Amino acid sequence: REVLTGGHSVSAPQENRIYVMDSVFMHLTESRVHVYDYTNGKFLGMVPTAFNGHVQVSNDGKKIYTMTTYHERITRGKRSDVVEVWDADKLTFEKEISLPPKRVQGLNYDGLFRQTTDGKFIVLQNASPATSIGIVDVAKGDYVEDVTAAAGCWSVIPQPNRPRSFMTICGDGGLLTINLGEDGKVASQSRSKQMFSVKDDPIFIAPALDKDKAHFVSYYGNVYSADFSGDEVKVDGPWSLLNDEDKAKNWVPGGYNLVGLHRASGRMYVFMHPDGKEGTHKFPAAEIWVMDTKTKQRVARIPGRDALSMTIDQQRNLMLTLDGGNVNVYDISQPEPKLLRTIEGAAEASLQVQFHPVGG
Amino acid sequence: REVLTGGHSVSAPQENRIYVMDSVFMHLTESRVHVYDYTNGKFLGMVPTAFNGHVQVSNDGKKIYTMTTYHERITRGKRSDVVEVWDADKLTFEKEISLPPKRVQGLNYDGLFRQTTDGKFIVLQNASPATSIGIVDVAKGDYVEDVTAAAGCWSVIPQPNRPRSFMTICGDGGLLTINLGEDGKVASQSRSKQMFSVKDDPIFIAPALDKDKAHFVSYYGNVYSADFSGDEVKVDGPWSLLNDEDKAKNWVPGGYNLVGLHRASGRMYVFMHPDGKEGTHKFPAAEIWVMDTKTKQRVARIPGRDALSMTIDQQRNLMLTLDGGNVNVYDISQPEPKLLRTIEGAAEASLQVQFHPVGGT
Amino acid sequence: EVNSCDYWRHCAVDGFLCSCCGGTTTTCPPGSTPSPISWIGTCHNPHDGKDYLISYHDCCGKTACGRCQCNTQTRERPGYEFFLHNDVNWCMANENSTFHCTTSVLVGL
Amino acid sequence: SLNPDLANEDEVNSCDYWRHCAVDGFLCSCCGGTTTTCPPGSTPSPISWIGTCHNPHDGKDYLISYHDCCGKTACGRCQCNTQTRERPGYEFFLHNDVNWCMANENSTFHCTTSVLVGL
Ligand SMILES: NCCc1c[nH]c2ccccc12
Ligand SMILES: NCCc1c[nH]c2ccccc12
After folding, report:
1. CA of D6 to nearest chain B CA: how many angstroms apart?
2. Catalytic amino acids of D?
């Protein structure tokens, strides 16, 4: 006689798992994270995230963090903005952390919900609509700092070469760097020189992030860089993604989470489309271009499969791309990406996919 | 220059309105009522109903009643089952009435969420999973108490010839009648003789409801009757919807809210499909059959448009049908229904549509 | 074959198959809780020609899985035969009544 | 061209209608409201993103304020995602990838309106 049981763990190893953040925009109060095995396309489980959830996996791979909004009666009653800590293997709720009722509600750019390199602090974007960066102490389960210095800035770019440092893009076209102390409070800060012209060459917020520098692409196909090998960030650019032939056909970048970097080679991946003009910066990819950031030249180009967002796994040399509903898996161990498979119907309305971390 | 404003009323008059209860089964925590104008297919507004909402309009036409379930954190935390009162013209929330945490969670059969003829009590199905009927005092904004007499029964059929009486179908194949007092407690009750064999000829719960009687169709295409013109309910049947030709091709009923009665003419409307067998009782309509309940003969048959649920308006002589997503409007002033229009994409997963009440005293 | 609506054990499933949802025919996906109560189907085994009782327990406390939706009605009956009835939420008595998916648990002949 | 209530219903309900040039959301005119009125039981956002849109009928450019209507769940009808002169969140009030109901008593967003401010 068979017996139904609960309490089970996800059936595939952590190193196989990816996380597709489904906004379910048509029914945005029932957003969720779908967990998939990228090796075979199998659905592994899910985490419910209420109204416009955001998600990330802890750097140590043990927990899933979500950020969401509740009201007592959904469309009326008192608001509660929270971070939730979930077990990564059991996909169960463990802890709620209260936030002030101003967490960013918006589509799932990576930089709206991040963590420090040492994993001890969650770093999230607020908008009331005045902007600030909120700091959650994971060990304490508390919102510990509100970085009002980041007013007029947007999004969080962690520095992988420091334990508790991150940058944000400001309305002056520069970057603000925040270094947190071991208590999560601001220990120091600095502002770069202007990197880009906000009016004349706006950048996409999505970084192509290396260990000690970040690259950004612009609405017109230029590349800017921020070097944070030192305490002061040094900024440079532009160089153009485009050669003369590319310009003739008006190629420009487009998408959401639209770039990525393969750190061992310095290859940068960017979604591009032809016939660019004002208003096409979120168009699906006609192609993925592969750029050598050292030589500042393109090395390869492949079909884009109408993708809008991507992410990279360094240690397995993989790139995922995502068109809103379907996830494509690519091998990027060599300069030309090779399509391995497509996972159809991974989401109804997703613009963000992430790997389970394996680095520890 | 231009200024955005709220506080507006529904743009079309009440007599144009219908209510499509969208379960949104794929995302059942965001169920809602869609309000449409049946005369032109225009979307007029909506009422959010959280997890598996149910809906009705007050008999006097002034309010929309919903029934739903909340939890503090949706998938965890304390449960709150409620009835909500909404203004029909402003589509705004007015009042929450607390229920015990056992209101029926299930697809939207009419009989799960009803009201007395006089409009004074809301009458709803509970399942814990033990069944009882819940009574809500509309004037007081209060839950009265369980009708525990209805254990082992299912669904609510109001008696339109009495102010605060209703019936329910019980597992013994008979009907239990409940008569409420002025306070919404049970004043008296009675139990009919067996109407149908539960094992050999199970009926669909959806009544074809007249003022002083109700008809029910069975899995095998038989009809049963309950007459409540007197204080004791008198039961009868079966008679067959089917002639020899019908039987030869195994026609049977199928659907959810699958019947209706046009009271003035005594015409009964029923969703039917061929090649019936065990497991086909919820199949979409291949046809709609129109039966004369007096002569017990079919007077019309038309294409079913894969419909699953219907509702009748006595005051304008209309029938609506619904296939899950689309609503069809029919004129039924004559024996053969005439298709007036289809409203495409009215819902993602709806099995219930209702008119805004006109008249009905 | 177990992920198909026509698999013999699924003859009175109205819901999403848990085997498509990170669980199996008889286990809930991670972080969803079995319902203690259930509707029951009597399903024909196409191999040995015998009928078996299948218990359809819902998995509860997570939002709709959305995969492998089935609506099969073999020997299903209305709510006046309540435990043969599948148009209700068999998570109705759980600590959280949100419905995620349905399992098909073989009881016996 | 400046008065959508006088225009063709099918025209204002199109994503291509000139004043919808930075709408990311469901058009309120398809949701039981109009271009400048929230559907019954939904509440205007006091804040908005702003677009600059060209009117081809009279050849002038107008500032359009995109207020959300709030406190009801997603309308689901006439979804648009137009991006003319839209910029990222470091130009916050030009940005349409956020919920402009974010500061309302209830932040659930229902649909978006396209309100003409001026030249
Ligand atoms: N104004 C629409 C902003 C938006 C697009 N996609 C989303 C997803 C979640 C929340 C907001 C959005
Ligand atoms: N076990 C499936 C019952 C069902 C069908 N539609 C529904 C809507 C709401 C709740 C349950 C249902």
Report:
1. 14
2. 49, 68
Let me know: does A126 contact A114? Beta carbons within 8 Å. no
Residue C82: phi, psi to the nearest 5?
-65, -40
Question: Which approach determined this entry?
Answer: X-ray
Residues having CB within 6 Å of any atom of ligand 2: B 23, 25, 28, 52, 105-107; C 14-15, 86-89
Contact at 8 Å (CB) between B144 and B136? yes
Exposed e or buried b per residue across A283-293, where buried means at least 16 C-beta atoms within 10 angstroms of its C-beta: bebbbbbbbeb
Q: For residues B201 and B239, is the Cβ–Cβ distance under 8 A?
A: no
Of the options 3.40.50.1970, 2.170.190.11, 3.40.50.300, 2.130.10.10, the CATH number for the domain spanning A13-356:
2.130.10.10
Burial class (CB in 10 A: 0-12, 13-18, 19+), B199: exposed
Closest ligand 1 atom to residue D98 Cα is 3
Strand order through the sheet with A153-158:
A153-158, A165-170, A175-180, A186-191
* The pair of three-digit structure tokens given for residue B106, joined into one six-digit string: 């299930």
Query: Edge-to-edge, what's the strand order for the sheet holding A327-331?
Result: A309-313, A318-322, A327-331, A338-343
Nearest in space to B20 (alpha carbons), one of B357, B345, B352: B352
Dihedral-angle region of residue C18 (phi above 0 means left; psi in -120 to 50 means alpha; beta otherwise)? alpha
User: Which of helix, strand or coil describes residue C81?
Assistant: helix
A240: β partners: A222
Which tokens sit at D91?
Answer: 């130009």
- The answer to whether domain C1-109 has CATH 3.40.50.300 is no
Asked if B11 lies within 8 A of D32 by C-beta distance, the reply is yes
Give the whole-angstrom CA distance, residue D106 versus residue A71: 8
Residue A51 to residue D72, Cβ atoms within 8 A: no
Q: What homologous superfamily does CATH list for D1-119?
A: Methylamine/Aralkylamine dehydrogenase light chain (2.60.30.10)
What's the number of CA atoms in the CB half-sphere (13 Å) around residue D59? 0
Which residues on adjacent β-strands are paired with residue A213?
A: A227
DSSP state of C12: T
- Decide: residue B275, CB within 10 A, 0-12 exposed, 13-18 middle, 19+ buried: exposed
Q: Are B16 and B39 in contact (CB under 8 A)?
A: yes
Cβ neighbours for A198, distance < 8 A, ≥ 6 positions apart = A171, A172, A173, D90, D91
The residue nearest atom 10 of ligand 2, judged by CA position, is B106
d(CA B72, CA B101): 13
Which DSSP string do the residues of B306-351 spell out, in sequence order? Answer: T--EEEEETTTTEEEEE-SS-EEEEE-SSSS-EEEEEETTS-SSEE
Q: Position of tokens 């400001």?
A: A170
B253 burial (CB, 10 Å; 0-12 / 13-18 / 19+) is buried
In angstroms, the CA D28 to CA A110 distance is 30
Cβ contact A154–D72 (<8 Å): no
Q: Are A349 and A22 in contact (CB under 8 A)?
A: yes
User: Domain locations in chain B?
Assistant: 13-356
Contacts of A73 by beta carbon, 8 Å cutoff, 6+ apart: B50, B70, B96
Placement of tokens 């954190």 in the chain: B73
**C-beta of residue A74 within 8 angstroms of C-beta of residue D108:** yes
Q: Which residues pair with D69 in a beta bridge?
A: D44, D111
Task: Give the Å distance between the CA of D97 and the centre of ligand 1.
Answer: 5
**What angle (nearest 5°) sits at the alpha carbon of residue B50, between those of residues B45 and B53?**
80
Q: Are A239 and A187 in contact (CB under 8 A)?
A: no
Q: Which two tokens stand for residue B279?
A: 């497991």
D93-114: burial string, b at 16+ Cβ within 10 Å, e else: ebbbbbbbbbbbebbbbbbbbb
Protein residue with its CA nearest to atom 4 in ligand 2:
C87
